[PDB]
Design an enzyme around this catalytic site. Structure first.
Site, PDB file in Angstrom:
ATOM      1  N   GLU A   1      -8.425  20.460   6.973  1.00 53.63           N
ATOM      2  CA  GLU A   1      -9.743  20.505   7.601  1.00 53.63           C
ATOM      3  C   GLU A   1     -10.467  21.838   7.436  1.00 53.63           C
ATOM      4  O   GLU A   1     -11.694  21.836   7.398  1.00 53.63           O
ATOM      5  CB  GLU A   1      -9.678  20.149   9.090  1.00 53.63           C
ATOM      6  CG  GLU A   1      -9.556  18.656   9.380  1.00 53.63           C
ATOM      7  CD  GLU A   1      -8.151  18.128   9.254  1.00 53.63           C
ATOM      8  OE1 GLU A   1      -7.869  17.404   8.276  1.00 53.63           O
ATOM      9  OE2 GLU A   1      -7.334  18.422  10.151  1.00 53.63           O
TER      10      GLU A   1
ATOM     11  N   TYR B   1      -8.042   6.395  -5.911  1.00 57.93           N
ATOM     12  CA  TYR B   1      -6.726   7.007  -6.072  1.00 57.93           C
ATOM     13  C   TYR B   1      -6.456   7.371  -7.528  1.00 57.93           C
ATOM     14  O   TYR B   1      -5.888   8.433  -7.810  1.00 57.93           O
ATOM     15  CB  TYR B   1      -5.649   6.079  -5.512  1.00 57.93           C
ATOM     16  CG  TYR B   1      -5.715   5.956  -4.004  1.00 57.93           C
ATOM     17  CD1 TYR B   1      -6.424   6.882  -3.247  1.00 57.93           C
ATOM     18  CD2 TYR B   1      -5.080   4.917  -3.339  1.00 57.93           C
ATOM     19  CE1 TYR B   1      -6.494   6.780  -1.873  1.00 57.93           C
ATOM     20  CE2 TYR B   1      -5.145   4.806  -1.961  1.00 57.93           C
ATOM     21  CZ  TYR B   1      -5.853   5.741  -1.234  1.00 57.93           C
ATOM     22  OH  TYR B   1      -5.923   5.638   0.136  1.00 57.93           O
TER      23      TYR B   1
ATOM     24  N   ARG C   1       0.824  -1.201   0.000  1.00 55.72           N
ATOM     25  CA  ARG C   1       0.000   0.000   0.000  1.00 55.72           C
ATOM     26  C   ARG C   1       0.863   1.258   0.000  1.00 55.72           C
ATOM     27  O   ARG C   1       0.356   2.369  -0.186  1.00 55.72           O
ATOM     28  CB  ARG C   1      -0.943  -0.029   1.206  1.00 55.72           C
ATOM     29  CG  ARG C   1      -2.184   0.835   1.070  1.00 55.72           C
ATOM     30  CD  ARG C   1      -3.163   0.541   2.195  1.00 55.72           C
ATOM     31  NE  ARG C   1      -4.367   1.359   2.110  1.00 55.72           N
ATOM     32  CZ  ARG C   1      -5.234   1.516   3.101  1.00 55.72           C
ATOM     33  NH1 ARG C   1      -5.068   0.914   4.267  1.00 55.72           N
ATOM     34  NH2 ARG C   1      -6.296   2.294   2.916  1.00 55.72           N
TER      35      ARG C   1
ATOM     36  N   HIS D   1      -7.325  -3.395   6.030  1.00 55.93           N
ATOM     37  CA  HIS D   1      -8.104  -2.866   4.910  1.00 55.93           C
ATOM     38  C   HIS D   1      -8.651  -3.948   3.989  1.00 55.93           C
ATOM     39  O   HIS D   1      -9.872  -4.133   3.930  1.00 55.93           O
ATOM     40  CB  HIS D   1      -7.259  -1.901   4.076  1.00 55.93           C
ATOM     41  CG  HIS D   1      -8.063  -1.037   3.154  1.00 55.93           C
ATOM     42  ND1 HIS D   1      -7.501  -0.343   2.103  1.00 55.93           N
ATOM     43  CD2 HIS D   1      -9.389  -0.763   3.117  1.00 55.93           C
ATOM     44  CE1 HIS D   1      -8.444   0.324   1.463  1.00 55.93           C
ATOM     45  NE2 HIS D   1      -9.599   0.087   2.058  1.00 55.93           N
TER      46      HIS D   1
ATOM     47  N   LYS E   1       1.933  -9.645 -11.818  1.00 63.31           N
ATOM     48  CA  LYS E   1       2.710  -8.748 -10.965  1.00 63.31           C
ATOM     49  C   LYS E   1       4.159  -8.631 -11.420  1.00 63.31           C
ATOM     50  O   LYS E   1       4.778  -7.577 -11.229  1.00 63.31           O
ATOM     51  CB  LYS E   1       2.637  -9.186  -9.507  1.00 63.31           C
ATOM     52  CG  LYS E   1       2.966  -8.046  -8.576  1.00 63.31           C
ATOM     53  CD  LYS E   1       2.948  -8.464  -7.135  1.00 63.31           C
ATOM     54  CE  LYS E   1       3.003  -7.227  -6.265  1.00 63.31           C
ATOM     55  NZ  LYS E   1       2.845  -7.564  -4.836  1.00 63.31           N
TER      56      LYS E   1
ATOM     57  N   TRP F   1      -1.788 -13.869 -10.606  1.00 62.31           N
ATOM     58  CA  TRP F   1      -1.258 -12.597 -10.151  1.00 62.31           C
ATOM     59  C   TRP F   1       0.267 -12.617 -10.113  1.00 62.31           C
ATOM     60  O   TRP F   1       0.880 -11.734  -9.508  1.00 62.31           O
ATOM     61  CB  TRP F   1      -1.926 -12.285  -8.802  1.00 62.31           C
ATOM     62  CG  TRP F   1      -1.382 -11.198  -7.928  1.00 62.31           C
ATOM     63  CD1 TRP F   1      -1.126 -11.279  -6.589  1.00 62.31           C
ATOM     64  CD2 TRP F   1      -1.058  -9.861  -8.317  1.00 62.31           C
ATOM     65  NE1 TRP F   1      -0.664 -10.074  -6.122  1.00 62.31           N
ATOM     66  CE2 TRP F   1      -0.607  -9.189  -7.166  1.00 62.31           C
ATOM     67  CE3 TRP F   1      -1.095  -9.169  -9.531  1.00 62.31           C
ATOM     68  CZ2 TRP F   1      -0.211  -7.857  -7.190  1.00 62.31           C
ATOM     69  CZ3 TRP F   1      -0.678  -7.855  -9.555  1.00 62.31           C
ATOM     70  CH2 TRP F   1      -0.252  -7.209  -8.391  1.00 62.31           C
TER      71      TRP F   1
ATOM     72  N   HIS G   1      -5.392  10.791  16.384  1.00 58.80           N
ATOM     73  CA  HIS G   1      -5.627  10.826  14.947  1.00 58.80           C
ATOM     74  C   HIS G   1      -6.593  11.957  14.617  1.00 58.80           C
ATOM     75  O   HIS G   1      -7.782  11.878  14.953  1.00 58.80           O
ATOM     76  CB  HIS G   1      -6.177   9.487  14.455  1.00 58.80           C
ATOM     77  CG  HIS G   1      -6.455   9.454  12.986  1.00 58.80           C
ATOM     78  ND1 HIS G   1      -7.606   8.910  12.458  1.00 58.80           N
ATOM     79  CD2 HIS G   1      -5.732   9.899  11.931  1.00 58.80           C
ATOM     80  CE1 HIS G   1      -7.580   9.020  11.142  1.00 58.80           C
ATOM     81  NE2 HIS G   1      -6.453   9.617  10.797  1.00 58.80           N
ATOM     82  N   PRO G   2      -6.127  13.024  13.965  1.00 61.52           N
ATOM     83  CA  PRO G   2      -7.017  14.151  13.641  1.00 61.52           C
ATOM     84  C   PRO G   2      -8.004  13.768  12.548  1.00 61.52           C
ATOM     85  O   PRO G   2      -7.664  13.031  11.619  1.00 61.52           O
ATOM     86  CB  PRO G   2      -6.048  15.245  13.171  1.00 61.52           C
ATOM     87  CG  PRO G   2      -4.681  14.784  13.626  1.00 61.52           C
ATOM     88  CD  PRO G   2      -4.742  13.294  13.554  1.00 61.52           C
TER      89      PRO G   2
END
Lengths: 596, 97
Positions: free
Chosen positions: A357, A497, A255, A487, A463, A459, A327-328
């Site tokens: 924010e 993304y 990731r 996740h 890959k 894969w 964590h904000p």
């Protein structure tokens, strides 16, 4: 009597009572992760269980409510999201088996530990140690033991569990009138009832290939970039004709990727932008930077914020007996009561997150004027893009100097841009291979062209043509290294993304050109744009009524995302992708294997 | 708005049709919504409109109260004791006044 009035009064009544419930539910999530008390936990167990009761009831009740005799089209999407037949058409036996499977994995996930070799006392909760060593240093066998173990305990216990889950998901959402579980997921992007701009469940198969084959000449050479950007690493354990081992993912599915780059570096003498000593000398605070952001947004014309925002918003670390994580996030309680949370400490990234924010404050005050059940932006694609436009513009020296971190005597050069592009090259270019892999594997299996037992094997040719990772210890159905992360241990998808990457430069270019600016799309800023400020603030007032082409033609005039900016906005990067590789091997052969 | 939950006061949100100027409406009855009859109870296409405040100190500015007083001076024919206060001054004698 027609059912349009019935269903609109029904949705309004849901707004009323379910807004009592969802207002106390937003406040309850807020309290839950700011107060940890057993009665509040019992509220999470019991009072929080009152949340899930009513939505299903009217989901079943509105299921009886019909679709035929409705003028005022709005209700058509309402029932498709409020009948919510979906999974309820099939049997509670199927849904109950999968759900109790989820409860089992949730409990065993909550209870998990794995730790050191030969020393099972200094044990390692995956938080503080050898994993951080994997990224800050280059410790090969270390990330081995970490990632091998963090599936070997979790993944094996739920392998029949997870496999039955996935196969029976295939069955349900084959029966869902959709194609499989992932087309059940795909049900987000459908739009119709306005002429000319329909989107179907089969046309999306081909076009994204075309934009990906408009990635591919970049991508196959972007492929030929990381492939080549890993050359100077290890001569003896990686043959130049060989496939690279599996334990270079960066994560438990790759990731994030920036690992071998600073070893491969051609020019790394110059340190990064570090001003921490200056912060220590001057000692600014988040309160000062708060009005700094306020007056910067005033420079683009943005107002202040009301009392109820921050008389519950705690901006400092509580400590003592009130334990709160740092964590904000950006929050919303609804009904003209909006609240936010952050931890305070002097950091440029914390300042940029605070700007994130506040830009979000305006940018999702965007859709606070819509009826309760529809308060969103035109589609869901602009979101992760218009969120970070201004922050990424602030990443350039201009706004970071306007906030006063740098002295005026600094002269401007293009070498700053060249090494900033280089830094993005050794930092960010890693995720897109896996991203589009999951995206395209998702669309084929969701139409049914790739199996599950040979998931790893198919894969592997992939890959070795995606980002270069293959097992040195090949995985059969027993051994175990996908699910070491939460996740995709919880089965999501990966289009956002790509949407962010191609959409953000389109928004910058369109804002530049309506504001009548010209130049490259790395240098295309949106600052001091008041005449487009009432456009930029109108870029944030859409709703959810129209197909995406209408919204595009209104906000910017270009109805579709443009990939000529992909092939010619990388024209400098795609060349710096070549220029950095002009004196390096363009390619790295792919036939040798470690275990033979 | 009171702290512990203002489930004392109540809101009203619905009616059947339009209304004339200047009258008081206290309708709390079931509304007949669809083709099915209501018989005065919630059920097949039926609805009861009344709900309470349930105010906690958290509710926002738009839903915070704003006491509106419509001072309806309805003009008709009376001597109307209620017209307005009258002032006065001091008197001076033996002068052309």
């Amino acid at each position: 009597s027609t059912t349009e009035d019935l269903a609109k009064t029904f949705l309004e009544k849901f707004n009323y009572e379910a807004e009592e419930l969802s207002y106390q539910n937003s406040l309850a999530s807020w309290n839950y992760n700011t107060n940890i008390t057993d009665e509040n936990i019992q509220k999470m167990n019991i009072a929080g269980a009152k949340w899930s009761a009513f939505y299903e009831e009217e989901s079943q009740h509105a299921k009886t409510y019909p679709l035929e005799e409705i003028q005022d089209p709005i209700i058509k999407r309402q029932l498709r999201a409020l009948q919510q037949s979906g999974s309820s058409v099939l049997s509670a036996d199927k849904r109950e088996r999968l759900n109790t499977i989820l409860n089992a994995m949730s409990t065993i996930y909550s209870t998990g530990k794995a730790c050191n070799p030969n020393n099972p006392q200094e044990c390692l909760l995956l938080e503080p140690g050898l994993d951080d060593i994997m990224e800050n240093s280059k410790d090969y066998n270390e990330r081995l033991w970490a990632w091998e173990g963090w599936r070997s305990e979790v993944g094996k216990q739920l392998r029949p569990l997870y496999e039955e889950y996935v196969a029976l998901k295939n069955e349900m959402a084959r029966a869902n009138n959709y194609e499989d579980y992932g087309d059940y997921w795909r049900g987000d992007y459908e739009e119709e009832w306005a002429d000319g701009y329909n989107y179907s469940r089969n046309q999306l198969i081909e076009d994204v290939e075309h934009t990906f084959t408009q990635i591919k000449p970049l991508y196959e050479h972007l492929h030929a970039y990381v492939r080549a950007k890993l050359m100077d690493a290890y001569p003896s354990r990686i043959s130049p004709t060989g496939c690279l081992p599996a334990h270079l993912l960066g994560d438990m599915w790759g990731r994030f990727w920036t690992n071998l780059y600073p070893l491969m570096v051609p020019f790394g003498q110059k340190p990064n932008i570090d001003v921490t000593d200056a912060m220590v000398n001057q000692s600014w605070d988040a309160r000062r930077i708060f009005k700094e952001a306020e007056k910067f947004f005033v420079s683009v014309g943005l107002p202040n914020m009301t009392e109820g925002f921050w008389q519950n918003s705690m901006l400092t670390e509580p400590g003592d007996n009130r334990k709160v994580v740092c964590h904000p996030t950006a929050w919303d309680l609804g009904k003209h009561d909006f609240r936010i949370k952050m931890c305070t400490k002097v950091t440029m990234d914390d300042f940029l997150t605070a700007h994130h924010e506040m830009g979000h404050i305006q940018y999702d005050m965007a859709y606070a004027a819509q009826p309760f059940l529809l308060r969103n932006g035109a589609n869901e694609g602009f979101h992760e893009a218009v969120g970070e436009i201004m922050s990424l513009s602030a990443a350039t020296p201009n706004h970071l100097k306007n906030i006063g971190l740098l002295p005026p005597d600094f002269s401007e050069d293009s070498e700053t841009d060249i090494n900033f592009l280089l830094k993005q090259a050794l930092t960010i270019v890693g995720t897109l291979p896996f991203t589009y892999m999951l995206e395209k594997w998702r669309w084929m299996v969701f139409k049914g062209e790739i199996p599950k037992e040979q998931w790893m094997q198919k894969w592997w040719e992939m890959k070795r043509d995606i980002v270069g990772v293959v097992e040195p210890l090949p995985h059969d159905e027993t051994y175990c290294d996908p699910a070491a992360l939460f996740h995709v241990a919880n089965d999501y998808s990966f289009i956002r993304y790509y949407t962010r990457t191609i959409y953000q430069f389109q928004f910058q270019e369109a804002l530049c050109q309506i504001a009548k600016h010209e130049g490259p799309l790395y240098k295309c800023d949106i600052s001091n744009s008041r005449e487009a400020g009432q456009k930029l603030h109108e870029m944030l007032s859409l709703g959810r009524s129209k197909p995406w082409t209408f919204a595009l033609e209104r906000v910017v005039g270009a109805k579709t995302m443009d990939v000529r900016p992909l092939l010619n906005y990388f024209e400098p990067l795609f060349t710096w992708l070549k220029e950095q590789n002009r004196n390096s091997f363009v390619g790295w052969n792919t036939d040798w294997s470690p275990y033979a | 708005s009171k702290v512990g939950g203002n489930y004392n006061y109540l809101f009203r949100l619905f009616r059947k049709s339009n209304l004339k100027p200047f009258e008081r409406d206290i309708s709390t009855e079931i509304y007949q919504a669809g083709s099915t009859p209501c018989n005065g109870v919630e059920g097949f296409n039926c609805y009861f409109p009344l709900q309470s405040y349930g105010f906690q100190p958290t509710n926002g500015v738009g839903y915070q109260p704003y006491r509106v007083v419509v001072l309806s001076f309805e003009l008709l024919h009376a001597p109307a004791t209620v017209c307005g206060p009258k002032k006065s001054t001091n008197l001076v004698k033996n002068k052309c006044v």
